[PDB]
Amino acid sequence: GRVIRNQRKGRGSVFTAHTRLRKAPAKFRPLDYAERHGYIRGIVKEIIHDPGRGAPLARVVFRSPYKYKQITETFIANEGMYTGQFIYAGKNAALTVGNILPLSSVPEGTVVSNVEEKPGDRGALGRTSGNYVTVVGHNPDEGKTRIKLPSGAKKVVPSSSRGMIGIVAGGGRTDKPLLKASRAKHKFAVKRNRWPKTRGVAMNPVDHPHGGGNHQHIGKASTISRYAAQGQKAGLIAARRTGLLRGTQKTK
Amino acid sequence: PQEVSDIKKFIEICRRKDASSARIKKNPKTQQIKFKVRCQRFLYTLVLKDSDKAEKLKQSLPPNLQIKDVPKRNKR
Amino acid sequence: SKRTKKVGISGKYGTRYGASLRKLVKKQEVTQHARYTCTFCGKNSVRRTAVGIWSCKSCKKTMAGGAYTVSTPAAAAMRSTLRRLREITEA
Amino acid sequence: MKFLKTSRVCLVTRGRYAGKKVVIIQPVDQGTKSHPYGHALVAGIERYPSKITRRMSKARIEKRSKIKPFIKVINYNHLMPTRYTLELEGLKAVINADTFKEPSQREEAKKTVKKVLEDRYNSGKNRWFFTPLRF
Amino acid sequence: PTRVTYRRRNPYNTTSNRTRVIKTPGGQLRVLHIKKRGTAPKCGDCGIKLPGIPALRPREYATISKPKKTVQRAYGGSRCGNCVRDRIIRAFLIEEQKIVKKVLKEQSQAEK
Amino acid sequence: AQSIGAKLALVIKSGKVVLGYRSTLKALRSGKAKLILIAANTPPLRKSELEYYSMMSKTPVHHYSGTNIELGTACGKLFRCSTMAILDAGDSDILAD
RNA sequence: ACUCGUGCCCCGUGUGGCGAAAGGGAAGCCGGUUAAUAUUCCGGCACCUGGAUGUGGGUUUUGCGCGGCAACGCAACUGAACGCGGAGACGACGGCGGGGGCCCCGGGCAGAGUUCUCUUUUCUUCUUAACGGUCUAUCACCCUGGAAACAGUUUGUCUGGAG
RNA sequence: ACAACCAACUUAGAACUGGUACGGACAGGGGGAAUCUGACUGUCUAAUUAAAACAUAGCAUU
Ligand SMILES: [Mg+2]
Ligand SMILES: [Mg+2]
Ligand SMILES: [Mg+2]
Ligand SMILES: [Mg+2]
Ligand SMILES: [Mg+2]
Ligand SMILES: [Mg+2]
Ligand SMILES: [Mg+2]
Ligand SMILES: [Mg+2]
Ligand SMILES: [Mg+2]
Ligand SMILES: [Mg+2]
Ligand SMILES: [Mg+2]
Ligand SMILES: [Mg+2]
Ligand SMILES: [Mg+2]
Ligand SMILES: [Mg+2]
Ligand SMILES: [Mg+2]
Ligand SMILES: [Mg+2]
Ligand SMILES: [Mg+2]
Ligand SMILES: [Mg+2]
Ligand SMILES: [Mg+2]
Ligand SMILES: [Mg+2]
Ligand SMILES: [Mg+2]
Ligand SMILES: [Mg+2]
Ligand SMILES: [Mg+2]
Ligand SMILES: [Mg+2]
Ligand SMILES: [Mg+2]
C-alpha cells in the first residue's frame, strides 16, 4: 500500500503552516525584575488582526528599564482593551482587564488569558477567542495554584505563573455558519493545506485502511487501539466509547 | 531652459565666464525679439517687444562672446 | 417600503443553504453590520473592521470586542464580577 | 476672575514658538481692528540657557547662560496659562503694539528683554521659567 | 488614432511599467514611461497627511532643501501641529500634577 | 446628585449658560463663569485642561456622572455636550452647594 | 594623536552568502540619421549619483535667520552620539467627480475625389516632448463666531456645542 | 415672468404611406405535466466513462 495522507502530513512540504502574513508571535514580556517585584506600565498602540487567528492581537509599547530604547510587544488582546489604554504588568499591578499579573496576586474566581504553564514561558493556556482560564484556588504553602482550563480540565501551576485579566477577544466566532465552501476555503487558506478533505471510504485500499470494497464501508471496527502502528491510526483513536452522547459525562 | 525677466540680469548672465555664445531670434509675425545665451547648465532666454531696446542691448552686450542671428531654416 | 417579508439582510443568499442556516447567519450579520455608539466620544460611529476589532470613525479609537457584537454578555458579566471582587479586596 | 494679565506666565501652543514659555507684557482682552479677538503681547525665550555644571570654567558658564528672546502678538486660544508668574520691572512696557510695526523697534525690544531675562536668570530666581519644557 | 508600444523590454502591466500618452512635436502619438506617484508623509501620532510638505518618492527628498521638507515648529515634520499642541498641554499638566502630588504626599504623609 | 438635572433645567429656563468647550474656555478666560460641568466621558486631557483653567479662575467644577449625550439631554438640547459653563444662575440655587 | 604605518580612547544584544530581465529601485526627451542600430549614433535641450574645492549670497562675532494670531511661509538659515516617526508598503469590487489621449460635431485654411444632374459637398493636414518658472486645482487644517423653527449635504451617503 | 442665445440624446403622442411589410441580413430561450437521483456553486479518469462518483456547508463521534 501507499503512505496515507495523515502520514504524509508530518513530512512538511505542502502541509507546512502559512507564515507570511503573520507579523510576530503572541507572547508576554520576558519575566524580568520589574514584573517580579513591582509593576511596569505599557501603552496599547493598536489592535490588529492576525491572519489564521480568530482572536485579535494588541501591540503594546513598554520602556526598557535598562536602556533608552522602547520595546513593542505583541499580546493576545483581551476583550475590552482599546488603543491608547495603559496596561500594567507585574506583581503589584492592579486587578483590571488587560493587566498581566502572577496568579499568586489574583483572588479565586477570576478569569485570565494566556496563562503560563511555568513562569517565564510567556503564555500557553487559554489564548483563543472567547476562551479563558479560571483561578479555582491557591495553595500558598505549596506555592501553587489550581486553575480550570477551557476544556474543563483541572491543572496545578506554580503561583508565579502570569496571566492577563479578562477574556480573550473575538467573542462567539463559531456562532455563525460558514455556509459556503468558499468561506471554509478562505478560513483554511491562511492556516494550512488541510481543506477539502476526502473521506477514506471513498479511496482505494492502496490509499487508506478504509480502502475500497463494492460498497463504501469501513468493513472493520473504526475504533483503533492506542498502540497501533503508524499508518493504522485512522478513525477513532483510543476511543473510550462511541455513539451519540445522550447525557452528562462523568469525565471532565 | 530658463527665462530671464529683465535686461540687467540678462547682461549679468552674459558677463559670466561660462557663457559660450548668444543668438537673436526675431519673430516678425509676433513682433518679438528673443536674446538667448548658452551657459554651462541652462540656456537663458530674454523676450523683448521692440527693436530699440534690442539694438541697445546688442550694442551693450560684452564683445568677447559671439553673437548670431538665427537664420531661417537652420541646416542640419 | 419593505421589499421583503422575513428574509431581511439574508436575501442576498437567494434560495440556497436552507432557511434555518439563513436565519442563523442573518442573526449574526445584522449585529456585525450595525452601527454602535462610541463609549469614548459618544458618537454613533463604531463599526466592525476585523472579526474581533471595532473602531470608531470619529475619535479613531480601536477596541477589542466580540466576533459579531461590540461586547459579549460573558465579558460584561466578567467586568461586573471583576469590579465587585476587586472592591471587596481593596476595601 | 481674570488670570490672563501682565506678568502671567504662559506656554505657546501653536506657531513657530509652540512649547516656549512667555510672560505677558500687555493683555488685550477686547480685540483691536487687527486681531479682533482676545490676545496678548508677550515676551518669551526662544533658546534657553544651556545646562551648566560645577566643573566648568566661569567663561564657559557665562557663554552657556545666554538667552535668545522673542516678542510675539499671540491669540489667547494659542496660549496655555500657568499658575506661574514673573514680575520683572525691566519688562514693564517694553512692547506697546506699535513696536511690531517697525523691525528696528522689534530688535530694540528684543535686546531689552534679553538683558532683563539674563539678569533674572543669573539671579537664580524663577528657574521654572528658564527651564525648557520637555514634550 | 495610431496605436502605441512599450519603449522598454518589460511587456507587462506590473505597477512599475506605468505609461502615459503624449503627442510629440513630430506629430505622432507616443508613450512616456512615468514613475509612481509621490506619497505625502503622515503624522506619527494621528496618521493624517502633514500640510506644507511635498508628496515625493523617498529618494527625491534628498535633493530638495530642508525648509521644503519641514515646517518651522517643534516636531515640524512627522507631527501635525494639533498633536504637538496636545503634547505640550499634556506634558505641562502631567508635570503640574506630579509636583502637586509630591507636595501633597510630603505634607500629609511626612508631617510627623 | 439626582437634583442636578432639575437645577440645570431651572438654570437654563431662567439664567444663562454656554454649551461647548470653546465657549466654556472663553467664559473661564473672561472670568464670568460661575460653575463648569464636565461630562464623565470627556477626554482626560481636555478634562484636566478645564480643571486647570477653573483652578486659575477660582471657578467650581462639577463632574457630571453622565456622558455628553446625557449632559446635552439634561441641558434640554438634541445634541451632545462634553462640557458647559453657567454664566448666571437665576431662580435656581445651583451655586449654593 | 605623531616628521614617520604602528600610541591610545569610546560604542556592541547580530553574527554570512545566493535567490526576481513581471516585486522594491537615482537619473533622458524631442528632431534627424543607416542597407541593416538607436530613449544607445548625430544636433539641440536636460537630469541623477559621487567627489572636490571656488565665486556670490545668507548667518554670526558672549553666537547658530526672519515673518504669520494660526494653519504655515520665505533662497539658505550649525548641529555628534542615542532615540522616535514617516516613506518604500501593498486586497477585491461598486457608483460618482477631475485630467490626458482617442472618437464625434461646427467654422476656417491648403490639397485631393466627385461633378449628365445635385451636393456652401466627401476625404486628408492644421503638431508641440523631457526638463523648468509662474498661477490655479477636491480632501484636509487654521481664525472669527456660536447653531432647534436644527442646519449643511451626496447619485449613494453622511457631518456638526469633541464647534 | 417673457424673450434671446447655447446643447446632446432619451422618451411619448398623431397623421400620412406601402408588400399587411418592417429585431426584413446578422444577431437571437422551444415550452409544459411528472418520476428516479444528487441539495445548490464547484471537481475528476490529459487520449473511450462528467455521472447518481468526489468535494462542499451542516450534523455527529474520537
Ligand atoms: Mg508504503
Ligand atoms: Mg470529505
Ligand atoms: Mg473509487
Ligand atoms: Mg491497506
Ligand atoms: Mg484494519
Ligand atoms: Mg455511502
Ligand atoms: Mg457486511
Ligand atoms: Mg542577490
Ligand atoms: Mg522591476
Ligand atoms: Mg547623450
Ligand atoms: Mg547627441
Ligand atoms: Mg553634485
Ligand atoms: Mg558671506
Ligand atoms: Mg509589492
Ligand atoms: Mg497638451
Ligand atoms: Mg464610436
Ligand atoms: Mg472639421
Ligand atoms: Mg508647450
Ligand atoms: Mg417579434
Ligand atoms: Mg442558450
Ligand atoms: Mg450535483
Ligand atoms: Mg484539482
Ligand atoms: Mg477519458
Ligand atoms: Mg487509465
Ligand atoms: Mg468525455
Side-chain angles (χ1 to χ4, degrees), chain E residues 3-12 17-25 28-34:
Chain E
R3 293 168 282 192
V4 303
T5 67
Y6 283 132
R7 298 174 75 177
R8 299 169 178 183
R9 296 283 184 181
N10 185 355
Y12 310 108
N17 220 24
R18 297 166 53 84
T19 68
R20 69 180 186 95
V21 180
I22 58 161
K23 282 261 282 291
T24 73
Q28 64 180 20
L29 261 159
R30 201 181 286 170
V31 159
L32 218 39
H33 286 265
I34 62 185

Side-chain angles (χ1 to χ4, degrees), chain A residues 5 197-208 210-213 216:
Chain A
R5 178 191 60 221
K197 184 172 278 196
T198 307
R199 290 169 295 111
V201 289
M203 313 200 176
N204 294 127
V206 66
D207 297 319
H208 197 266
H210 295 182
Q216 282 204 1

Side-chain angles (χ1 to χ4, degrees), chain A residues 230-250:
Chain A
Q230 278 74 83
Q232 295 199 305
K233 278 181 174 172
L236 316 179
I237 306 313
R240 302 170 179 90
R241 59 162 308 289
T242 44
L244 189 73
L245 294 159
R246 312 211 72 144
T248 188
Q249 306 307 124
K250 186 170 182 176

Side-chain angles (χ1 to χ4, degrees), chain A residues 115-187:
Chain A
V115 185
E116 306 185 308
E117 273 165 324
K118 293 189 174 74
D121 65 9
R122 308 178 71 191
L125 306 167
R127 295 176 64 186
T128 315
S129 67
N131 276 312
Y132 52 88
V133 169
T134 308
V135 177
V136 170
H138 302 272
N139 197 315
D141 297 338
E142 197 65 43
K144 308 201 145 314
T145 291
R146 289 180 314 290
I147 62 181
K148 181 162 164 269
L149 301 184
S151 68
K154 301 317 221 275
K155 210 188 199 298
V156 169
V157 296
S159 303
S160 192
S161 285
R162 297 175 293 168
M164 183 190 268
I165 305 292
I167 300 177
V168 177
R173 173 170 41 78
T174 61
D175 280 7
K176 88 185 296 193
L178 285 166
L179 204 77
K180 274 165 67 175
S182 79
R183 281 181 182 164
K185 183 181 195 287
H186 279 292
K187 176 182 183 182

